[PDB]
Subunit: 195 residues, 4 copies
């Protein structure tokens, strides 16, 4: 499939990469990355545990802080600490290394480090991975842009770049879907910084 499959077709993991306190003042669009984390949290909660898993990593939180308090994590979020840049640490693997978890929606900090390397690692596991660019950021725009462009060249192998609104509507496919009415209000919310 070139786009995400419908949420009932397979299970989807939402990978929230290192959106932590010490990055908030160093990544220009941090506020959108929080917004996207909240949007996918709301989606995940609407889809339910039959269809969605929400995975959060924190890079060295002793030094870099917890996940931003502006994110309202779902109550069943799985949160892990790491020093590896890719999110695919041994505690995460039993959550995604299952044949039913076919596709990962990935976003966070930093685009050219943890996000990039996570996408690559997921491609090595033969998973579909969709970057939500509007929820990604780096400390410099050039680092971010060049990495997005790198990931856009991997479409052939199952990694592509999309936006959170496109991702929501990819998973649903049809306004008559039973969860549409529940999800529709998320798309009426506006990014804090213009996209």
């Amino acid at each position: 499939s070139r786009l995400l499959k419908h949420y009932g077709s397979c299970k989807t993991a939402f990978f929230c990469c290192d959106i932590q306190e010490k990055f908030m003042g160093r990544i220009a669009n941090s506020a959108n990355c929080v917004f996207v984390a909240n949007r996918f949290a709301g989606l995940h909660t609407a889809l339910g545990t039959a269809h969605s898993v929400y995975i959060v990593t924190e890079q060295y939180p002793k030094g870099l802080g917890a996940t931003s308090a502006d994110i309202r994590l779902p109550p069943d979020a799985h949160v892990f600490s790491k020093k590896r840049f890719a999110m695919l640490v041994p505690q995460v693997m039993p959550l995604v290394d299952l044949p039913e978890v076919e596709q990962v929606v990935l976003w966070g900090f930093e685009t050219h480090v943890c996000i990039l390397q996570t996408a690559a690692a997921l491609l090595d596991m033969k998973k579909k991975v969709v970057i939500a660019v509007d929820g990604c950021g780096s400390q410099s725009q050039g680092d971010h842009c060049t990495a997005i462009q790198l990931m856009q060249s991997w479409s052939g192998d199952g990694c592509y770049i999309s936006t959170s609104e496109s991702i929501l509507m990819q998973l649903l496919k049809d306004a008559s879907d039973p969860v549409f009415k529940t999800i529709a209000p998320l798309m009426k919310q506006t990014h804090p910084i213009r996209i």
Copy 2:
């Protein structure tokens, strides 16, 4: 063929995606999307039913309104209502699921939802699909741009992104073509918003 074939080689479907009243004030370049709808309407009428079919969808028109009144639909336009985001609903399938209808010119609202998903669905049917970017739009520029870029990565499989003027001249191939004189005035018309 990497570009559209000449109009006599196969039949071409013009897919006008959801250019409806309630989007007109929410999609910045809506006026160009109407302009492109009118340009392809004029082309379709010049080519005739031997070579062209014009298909319009409206997403939930009870809520989102009819197709914009600024569009002058051809008298033989096939207009359908849908809730599916992709245009390939059961009423549309007998119009395009024919071996002679090899290529679809696709444009409208919104780039990252209905247009994107329609392109993907057409690629699944092994059709050639050409996006007229100058007739596409989203409520946010970021959603639109990222989706265009996604579709530009699918060239290998028969989806590429072009403009209405390029599309017209792709179908004709030569100024001595019998319909050129009829079509040429369409290209002298100017987009309402600068491209």
Copy 3:
């Protein structure tokens, strides 16, 4: 080979597409397209007929005028009239449909019509084709940009987009090449409009 081969490896055709009087005031960067035509004219003359052929087309010159008088065509330029948008008309074919003419440097007007369609036609003939983007233009920037982007997606099949200076140095490969001293002054000339 991914780039142009060295000029002695095979013969190179310079395709100067329709840089005519009536377009000069309608294509914003027309002055650069003339500049690029002159640069390649100088290169062609330095390489000699052993290694280079210079082919000019004019689209309906009765209506659109001759090739711009600001271009100093080489004395052995082959100039042809056409109504086909692609340059590969029957009079041109005996100049390029030879196994030694492996690669074509292509530029001119308009990017999304004659240039685009010529590239496609050359790809059908299994030739390498390199677009000199700095010598290409359209009446609208959007038409031009979208077509360049389309052609950049065809790299896999032997069409890529480069610039005239890059093209010169691709053909030569080494400053100790016998023609370098002759060609070097062309690269010191400055585009009339900043690139």
Copy 4:
């Protein structure tokens, strides 16, 4: 592997292309290209000769000057003169034409000439090559941009475009890596010109 392998997996060559005195005042972002040369010099010295080789070329230094004095070359840098545009001259080949030297980090002047042609030559040798775009430049922005875009289309074959910070963290993979503490200060240094 789609990204650079970890530094212990194979040996990495840092190719510093022609960052010479006479270009410094002619390439707008020359100061960043020096900065990137220094960053990779520091990385190379931290990794050691087991894992890294630093190769510098100078194009006709009699005419174009030495490598910029603002670059602090490592004491074991291998520096060579050339007239070939590609860096893969006979003196360089015994440094990289070894099965252990699997990947080259490439940057310098000019993007559309020596850098471009070096990437192509390395691809011919079946090496992985990663362009550090933030350390590349040309005398004109258009020449540089178009060449970067050309190289971004070669990802399928083992050439991609990244940034120096992304490259550093690709080679390391994990903050608990023994050299991280040594390398981390390099990433806290700021480019002289905003990226």
